[PDB]
Amino acid sequence: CTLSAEDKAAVERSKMIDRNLREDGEKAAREVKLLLLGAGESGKNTIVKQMKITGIVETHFTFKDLHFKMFDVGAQRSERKKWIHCFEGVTAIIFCVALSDYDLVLMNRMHASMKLFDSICNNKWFTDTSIILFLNKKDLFEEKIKKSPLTICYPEYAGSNTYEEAAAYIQCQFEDLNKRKDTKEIYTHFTCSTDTKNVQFVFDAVTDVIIKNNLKDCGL
Amino acid sequence: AQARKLVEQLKMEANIDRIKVSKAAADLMAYCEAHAKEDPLLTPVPASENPFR
Amino acid sequence: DQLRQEAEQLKNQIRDARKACADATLSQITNNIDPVGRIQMRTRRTLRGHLAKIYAMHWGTDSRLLVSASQDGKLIIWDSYTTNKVHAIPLRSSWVMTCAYAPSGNYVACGGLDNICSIYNLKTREGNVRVSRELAGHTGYLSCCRFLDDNQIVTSSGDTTCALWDIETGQQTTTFTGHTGDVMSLSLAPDTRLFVSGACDASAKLWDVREGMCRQTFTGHESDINAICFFPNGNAFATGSDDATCRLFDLRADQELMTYSHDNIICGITSVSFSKSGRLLLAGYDDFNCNVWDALKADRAGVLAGHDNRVSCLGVTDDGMAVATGSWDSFLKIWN
Amino acid sequence: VQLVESGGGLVQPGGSRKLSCSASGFAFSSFGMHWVRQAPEKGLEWVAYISSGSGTIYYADTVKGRFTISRDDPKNTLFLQMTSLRSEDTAMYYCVRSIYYYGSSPFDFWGQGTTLTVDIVMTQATSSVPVTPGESVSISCRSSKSLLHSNGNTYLYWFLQRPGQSPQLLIYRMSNLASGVPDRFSGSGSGTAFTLTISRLEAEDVGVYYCMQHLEYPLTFGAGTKLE
Amino acid sequence: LSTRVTLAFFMSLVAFAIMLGNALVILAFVVDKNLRHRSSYFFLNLAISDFFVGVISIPLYIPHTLFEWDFGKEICVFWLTTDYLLCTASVYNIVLISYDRYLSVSNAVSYRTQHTGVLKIVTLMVAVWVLAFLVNGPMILVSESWSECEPGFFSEWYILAITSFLEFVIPVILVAYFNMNIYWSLWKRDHVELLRARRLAKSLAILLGVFAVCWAPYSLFTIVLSFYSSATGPKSVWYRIAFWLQWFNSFVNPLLYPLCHKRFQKAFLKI
Ligand SMILES: CN1CCN(C2=Nc3ccc(Cl)cc3Oc3ccccc32)CC1
């Protein structure tokens, strides 16, 4: 070692910087990160306010010793291709869709929700990222189907004009759009309004994703 | 108004002093020849002067 | 309709004016020059410590210090002779996409998806590094930023506008408009009186700084323009688009000169740069490997292979002694 | 920025003592710290060094085993512990600051000292120089070994001390000039022989000048040149 | 005869294969600074234990049985004690890896939210080595009245029974229990699913089966011989077949655990 004394002081400083960086990187991998998506007034605000509440918006909360960070991105008015690859390592995508808007042609809203869901699922950056699907406004849909059945937009539907038949039909219609059934799953829920079920469902789905990832890492 | 903006911009871009393409090629070749001897990646320097070993 | 017809007339005027000056091309005249032959380069150093993807870097003007940024929420200032770390700076928002290094060595800047450009002061009497400014007023993400001097900065955003800021006041001075799509890059001139910018509408524009009006428009690419750089002389520049081509455009002759492409390449370009004499054009690629081109012949594939993801950034020093590259696998490498 | 130390006083033979230094207004946890000494009738003399992270400690050969240096980061306070004091220990004591990375300026802020009462060599060629205002002067000192290292540096320092005040960095690494110093000072030379130069003398530039080396430990001072 | 030069070649080849594989695993750990996790430390421990068997005990055993009885009593004590310690250490490393993998699925929140990673790992590794020593060492050292160089406690079936128990009965039960729990925790959460459930079942079956088949026959045959006829003279070919089958496991071991894991595979790919 032919270094002078000042070179040795510089080496010590550099090693301390390395130590700090490594510790911060350790801490930054014990978290859960969710990307939040919806549509035009898909009632995404409700979901945000219910659970523990320019540019990107971040929400942070803690539940049952897990730390969730949720990123909402509705303020970016540009195309998705210049923008999406930054979120490649995200744990899951939380998607919101509204049910009561089956007879609100703006060519109705269900078609836009289907189109955007099909665009998101088959993305090349999300070949193993799972989705958590929320269906909103079950009530107003239930009263609105008392007068107008689903035939107004689903002429091929062949069931009665009741609640659960229509609900199951819409759920299967949205979950049939998957094209990667062997790699990732899709979870579904009907948005409650009375308690913490909207959060417990997310907690359970995330636990399932974590367990499956741990098993698949070991090649087992 | 957008058409008027386009008209004004096309007016400003229409009146351009111009030179031949061969002039640009000649100037590029001249600059590349004049300063060629001082490029440490075309003609690598001997290792006694190299600061990266 | 009259305005549209006169606009068509002016467009045809520009087209025919460009056609009139095509006495000869670049390829037919330089075919009598000796080539570079074969150029081989080796990795002298390897700088480790970033964890996530690396998005930009920038050389200092003393040719020894370097700055880099990643999605960790960290900026790092390195010494490239001994691979020592001089500074490590934590950011407020980790969605960073660009960085710059002041020509005097006193300041650094960075921006991202939060629409704000932050400016940091490196030389205080307290020993730490502090945020000196935050510049806000865009409505889309920030794509690039380049210091003019210790008190004037330039920015480009993804809301179709560019801005010139006066750092001490904190307010914009002039604004440049005219693109119909996101602006992706910019590159100052050696004399710092002009600059160029390319946009996602597959066109590039030349701007004058003092007054504030567009001067020239360069077209020809098929898709958006992803990286731009400016020839050392000051009279030409070269672009790289997402259709696997690079091109050379001359400011004065006002038309194209030469295209760099190859049939085995089917991915886009993410960075271009030049060498001191102007006899090498380096280009990063999506194929995981950089690539060196002979600027006056438009042929080579002298790869600098050795990366395990796509090459996001590269740069060449101010004297010519080294080339640095960084890529999505979190390692930054120095070649000589 | 401020460093204020205390703990000095008068002591008998034997015994022990502890001096402390409080830092205020800067990031005390990123700086290396020195203790330096000055005899009541002589020049300066380096004493001890503790680095940032407390992983390195250096002493002088006339004190090792009797002195101990320590730091305390959450409260920003530095300590020296002296054991079994003898007659040669009488002095003023200064706490000094320094930070090493590529391009930094060590030895730039000094404390104010406290009174305690009970190898390469550099030579100062003079002891007193009488001049008149408006003239230019030059001071010189000599070495015994080459100070030019293989990496290109030259670890030579020039310090100033006005009557009744603590010293103050003037020139670091033989050619560079500190910040806050009027740009009428300069320094040059070549291996083993060096010269500082002053142009257009003015008042409040009268006192003693020192030249120091930092090429290796221990660090060594000169006799001091008195300009009046 | 002159057919003793053909077997020597095969023995040397097996030793070479064992040492090569475990050296590769050790190199893979040492090269990279990203493989800093519990599982990679345990894989390092396993590789070391197998490597020492691969280097030491196989060559020295060739001239003893083929050419010349050039040991002496002290060298036999050394050789036997080393071999026993190494084998028991390998088995206990296998049990440790399975326990880690079971905690990785029975409780995911805590397994993600733990940060104690400084000394506990080395604590556990040293503990398994110490236990592996205490399994055998004292008994081989005590043996005085002990013919081919083999431990003297063979002359009584009690020590054989207890030693074989604490070697081979507890590990099989623990591995079976942990793997069944892993399978059930996946199967309950099933609802293309059939194929992956069957794949998981097949893989756990393969691991447990290879372990049991490689390590049972020698122990059972030894204790059965000892219970009636303390035969230390010439022995049939079955004894030798079992003897070598037990060492074959240390060559099987680093193909299954380290090389199925994904980041080890990437590190191998880079180099
Ligand atoms: C050389 N091969 C065959 C012999 N061997 C034995 N190892 C151990 C070690 C420890 C225990 Cl607790 C049990 C074993 O099982 C044995 C039982 C009886 C005779 C020998 C063994 C090592 C491998």
Identity (one letter) of the amino acid at B27? Answer: D
Helix spans in C240-320 (H): none
Q: How far is the CA of E95 from the centre of ligand 1 (A)?
A: 17
Give the length of chain C: 336
Write the CB contacts of A58 (distance below 8 Å, at least 6 apart in sequence).
Answer: A69, A70, A71, A72
DSSP-based three-state secondary structure for C36: coil
* Cβ contact, residue pair D26, C127, below 8 Å: yes
A105 in Cβ contact with A144 (< 8 Å): no
Rounded CA gap, E8 and E191, in Å? 56
C97 in Cβ contact with C109 (< 8 Å): no
Closest C-alpha to D174, from D194, D160, D197, D192: D194
Closest C-alpha to E83, from E136, E45, E138, E25: E136
Q: What is the 3-state secondary structure of chain A?
A: CCCCHHHHHHHHHHHHHHHHHHHHHHHCCCCEEEEEECCCCCCHHHHHHHCCCCCCEEEEEEECCEEEEEEECCCCCCCCCCCCHHHCCCCEEEEEEECHHHHCCCCCHHHHHHHHHHHHHCCHHHCCCEEEEEEECHHHHHHHCCCCCHHHCCCCCCCCCCHHHHHHHHHHHHHCCCCCCCCCCEEEEECCCCCCHHHHHHHHHHHHHHHHHHHHHCCC
The chains in contact with chain B, meaning 3 or more Cβ pairs closer than 8 Å, are C
Q: Is the Cα torsion angle E223, E224, E226, E232 positive or negative in sign?
A: negative
* Residue corresponding to tokens 């001049």: D131
Q: Compute and round to an integer the Cα radius of gyration of chain A.
A: 23
Closest C-alpha to B41, from C308, C45, C298, C273: C273
CB atoms within 10 A of CB E222: 17
Identity (one letter) of the amino acid at A136? Answer: N
Q: Residue ranges per domain, chain E?
A: 4-270
Rounded CA gap, D34 and D21, in Å? 11
Rounded CA gap, E104 and E96, in Å? 13
**Cα-flanking dihedrals φ and ψ of residue C219, to 5°?**
-125, 170
DSSP string, chain D: -EEEEE--EE--SEEEEEEEEEEESS-GGG-EEEEEEE-TTS-EEEEEEE-TTS--EEE-TTTTTTEEEEEETTTTEEEEEEEEE-GGG-EEEEEEEE--STT---S--B---EEEE-----EES-S-B---TT--EEEEEE-SS--B-TTS-B-EEEEEE-TTS--EEEEETTTEE-TTS-TTEEEEEETTEEEEEE-S--SS--EEEEEEE-SSSSPB----EEE-
Cα B5 to the chain's mean position, in Å? 30
**Cα-flanking dihedrals φ and ψ of residue C68, to 5°?**
-150, 155
D31 in Cβ contact with D52 (< 8 Å): yes
* Residue corresponding to tokens 């380049």: C146
Rounded CA gap, C94 and C68, in Å? 13
Farthest-apart Cα atoms in chain A, separation: 89
Question: How far is C70 from chain A, CA to nearest CA, in Å?
Answer: 11
* Cβ contact, residue pair D52, A12, below 8 Å: yes
C127 in Cβ contact with C87 (< 8 Å): no
Residue in A5, A12, A13 closest to D216 by CB: A5
C126 in Cβ contact with D1 (< 8 Å): yes
The DSSP code for B38 is G
Q: Is the Cα torsion angle A47, A53, A58, A64 positive or negative in sign?
A: negative
Write the CB contacts of D1 (distance below 8 Å, at least 6 apart in sequence).
Answer: C125, C126, D24, D25, D26, D109
Q: Residue ranges per domain, chain A?
A: 32-209
Rounded CA gap, A220 and E174, in Å? 18
* Residue numbers in A near C93 (CB within 8 A): 55-56
C70 in Cβ contact with C50 (< 8 Å): yes
Rounded CA gap, C98 and C111, in Å? 6
* Cβ contact, residue pair B38, C255, below 8 Å: no
E31 in Cβ contact with E268 (< 8 Å): no
Assigned CATH topology for domain E4-270: Rhopdopsin 7-helix transmembrane proteins (1.20.1070)
Closest C-alpha to C170, from C152, C144, C186, C145: C152
Cα C115 to the chain's mean position, in Å? 19
Long-range contacts of residues C9-17, Cβ cutoff 8 Å, at least 24 apart? C10/B7, C10/B10, C10/B11, C10/B14, C11/B10, C13/B14, C14/B10, C14/B13, C14/B14, C17/B14, C17/B16, C17/B18, C17/C254
CB atoms within 10 A of CB C212: 13
Determine contact: B30 vs chain C, CB below 8 A.
no
Rounded CA gap, B13 and C213, in Å? 11
**Cα-flanking dihedrals φ and ψ of residue E186, to 5°?**
-75, -40
Rounded CA gap, E167 and E132, in Å? 10
Assigned CATH topology for domain A32-209: Rossmann fold (3.40.50)
At CB < 8 Å, which residues of chain A contact C? 7, 10-11, 13-14, 17-18, 20-21, 24-25, 28, 54-56, 76-79, 82-83, 86
Domain D2-118 has CATH 2.60.40.10: yes
Domain that holds residue C50: 1-335
B and C adjacent (3 or more CB pairs under 8 angstroms)? yes
* Residue numbers in E near A214 (CB within 8 A): 104-105, 108, 111
CATH number reported for the structural domain that contains residue C328 in this entry: 2.130.10.10
C312 in Cβ contact with C284 (< 8 Å): yes
Give the length of chain A: 220
User: Encoding tokens for residue C135?
Assistant: 């510049």
Closest C-alpha to D214, from D169, D180, D164: D169
Burial C72-90 (b: 16+ CB within 10 A, else e): bbbbbbbbbbeebbbbbbe
Rounded CA gap, E151 and E144, in Å? 9
Question: How far is C329 from chain B, CA to nearest CA, in Å?
Answer: 24
The DSSP code for C51 is -
User: Encoding tokens for residue D55?
Assistant: 């992983």
Write the CB contacts of A149 (distance below 8 Å, at least 6 apart in sequence).
Answer: A157, A161, A166
Beta-strand pair C96-101/C84-90: unpaired
Asked how this structure was determined, the answer is cryo-EM
Burial status of residue E269 (CB atoms within 10 A of its CB: 0-12, 13-18, 19 or more):
exposed
- Identify the bridge partners of residue C134 per DSSP, sorted by sequence position: C118
DSSP-based three-state secondary structure for C124: coil
User: Encoding tokens for residue E99?
Assistant: 């326990």
| Cis bond upstream, residue D218 (ω within 30) | yes
User: Encoding tokens for residue C320?
Assistant: 């010519």
Q: Is the Cα torsion angle C91, C93, C94, C96 positive or negative in sign?
A: negative
User: Encoding tokens for residue A49?
Assistant: 């306010």
What are the distances in angstroms from CA A135 to CA A52, A101, A123, A166? Answer: 20, 11, 22, 13
Rounded CA gap, C196 and C41, in Å? 31
Rounded CA gap, E269 and C289, in Å? 18
What are the distances in angstroms from CA C149 to CA C68, C104, C170? Answer: 20, 8, 15
Q: What angle do CA A143, A37, C135 make, to 5 degrees?
A: 130
C314 in Cβ contact with C323 (< 8 Å): yes
- Identify the bridge partners of residue D160 per DSSP, sorted by sequence position: D168, D209
* Cβ contact, residue pair D102, C86, below 8 Å: yes
Question: How far is A155 from chain E, CA to nearest CA, in Å?
Answer: 31
* Cβ contact, residue pair E112, A181, below 8 Å: no
Rounded CA gap, A1 and E87, in Å? 44
The DSSP code for C64 is S
Question: How far is A39 from chain E, CA to nearest CA, in Å?
Answer: 29
Identity (one letter) of the amino acid at D132? Answer: T
For the CA atoms of E154, E158, E160, E162, the dihedral, rounded to the nearest 10 degrees, stands at -160
User: Encoding tokens for residue E243?
Assistant: 């003897």
Closest C-alpha to E137, from E86, E91, E191, E103: E86
Burial E179-199 (b: 16+ CB within 10 A, else e): beebbeebeeeeeeeeeeeee
E43 in Cβ contact with E25 (< 8 Å): yes
- Identify the bridge partners of residue C57 per DSSP, sorted by sequence position: C68
Identity (one letter) of the amino acid at E269? Answer: L
- Identify the bridge partners of residue A190 per DSSP, sorted by sequence position: A135
Rounded CA gap, A75 and C305, in Å? 40
**DSSP H or E segment with residue B7:** helix B2-14
Rounded CA gap, C147 and C59, in Å? 13
The DSSP code for B3 is H
Determine contact: C79 vs chain D, CB below 8 A.
yes
User: Encoding tokens for residue B53?
Assistant: 């070993």
In the structure, how many helices (H) and strands (E) does chain C have? 1, 27
Cα D187 to the chain's mean position, in Å? 18
Q: What angle do CA E96, E99, E104 make, to 5 degrees?
A: 130
Could you give the count of Cα atoms lying within 13 Å of D81 in the half-sphere of its Cβ?
6
Write the CB contacts of D85 (distance below 8 Å, at least 6 apart in sequence).
Answer: D11, D13, D14, D15, D16, D17, D118
Farthest-apart Cα atoms in chain C, separation: 67
DSSP-based three-state secondary structure for B25: helix
Task: Pick the residue whose CA is nearest to atom 18 on ligand 1.
Answer: E219
Residue in A2, A5, A13 closest to D101 by CB: A13
A134 in Cβ contact with A191 (< 8 Å): yes
Which residues form the pocket of ligand 1, taking CB atoms under 6 Å from any ligand atom?
E 83-84, 87-88, 135-136, 163-164, 166-167, 218-219, 222, 243, 246-247
- Identify the bridge partners of residue D110 per DSSP, sorted by sequence position: D96
Rounded CA gap, E268 and C311, in Å? 23
C228 in Cβ contact with C197 (< 8 Å): yes
Q: Residue ranges per domain, chain D?
A: 2-118, 122-227
DSSP-based three-state secondary structure for B29: helix
Rounded CA gap, C190 and E158, in Å? 91
Rounded CA gap, A129 and A209, in Å? 9
Rounded CA gap, C110 and C89, in Å? 11
Rounded CA gap, C82 and E148, in Å? 62
* Residue numbers in D near A10 (CB within 8 A): 100-102
* Cβ contact, residue pair B27, C235, below 8 Å: yes
Beta-strand pair A32-37/A92-98: parallel
Domain that holds residue B44: 1-52
Rounded CA gap, E34 and E40, in Å? 10
User: Encoding tokens for residue D52?
Assistant: 């940032």
CATH class of D122-227: mainly beta
Q: What is the 3-state secondary structure of chain E?
A: CCCHHHHHHHHHHHHHHHHHHHHHHHHHHHHCCCCCCHHHHHHHHHHHHHHHHHHCHHHHHHHHHHCCCCCCHHHHHHHHHHHHHHHHHHHHHHHHHHHHHHHHHHCHHHHHCCCCCCCHHHHHHHHHHHHHHHHHHHHHHHCCCCCCCCCHHHHCHHHHHHHHHHHHHHHHHHHHHHHHHHHHHHHCCCCCHHHHHHHHHHHHHHHHHHHHHHHHHHHHHHHHHHHHCCCCCCCCHHHHHHHHHHHHHHHHHHHHHHHHCHHHHHHHHHC
* Ligand 1 atom nearest to CA at E167: 12
**Cα-flanking dihedrals φ and ψ of residue C129, to 5°?**
-125, 130
The total domain count for chain C is 1
Rounded CA gap, C68 and C59, in Å? 9
In what side-by-side order are the strands of the sheet with D114-117?
A: D9-10, D114-117, D91-98, D32-38, D44-50, D57-59
A185 in Cβ contact with E191 (< 8 Å): no
Farthest-apart Cα atoms in chain D, separation: 52
Burial status of residue C215 (CB atoms within 10 A of its CB: 0-12, 13-18, 19 or more):
middle
Rounded CA gap, E88 and E246, in Å? 12
For the CA atoms of D111, D117, D120, D122, the dihedral, rounded to the nearest 10 degrees, stands at 80
**Cα-flanking dihedrals φ and ψ of residue A182, to 5°?**
-85, -15
**Cα-flanking dihedrals φ and ψ of residue A9, to 5°?**
-65, -40
The chains in contact with chain E, meaning 3 or more Cβ pairs closer than 8 Å, are A
**Cα-flanking dihedrals φ and ψ of residue C296, to 5°?**
-100, 5
User: Encoding tokens for residue D222?
Assistant: 């000169």
Window 82-121 of C: residues touching A by CB (8 A cutoff) are: 82, 84-85, 88, 93, 95, 113-116
Residue in chain C nearest D98 by alpha carbon? C127
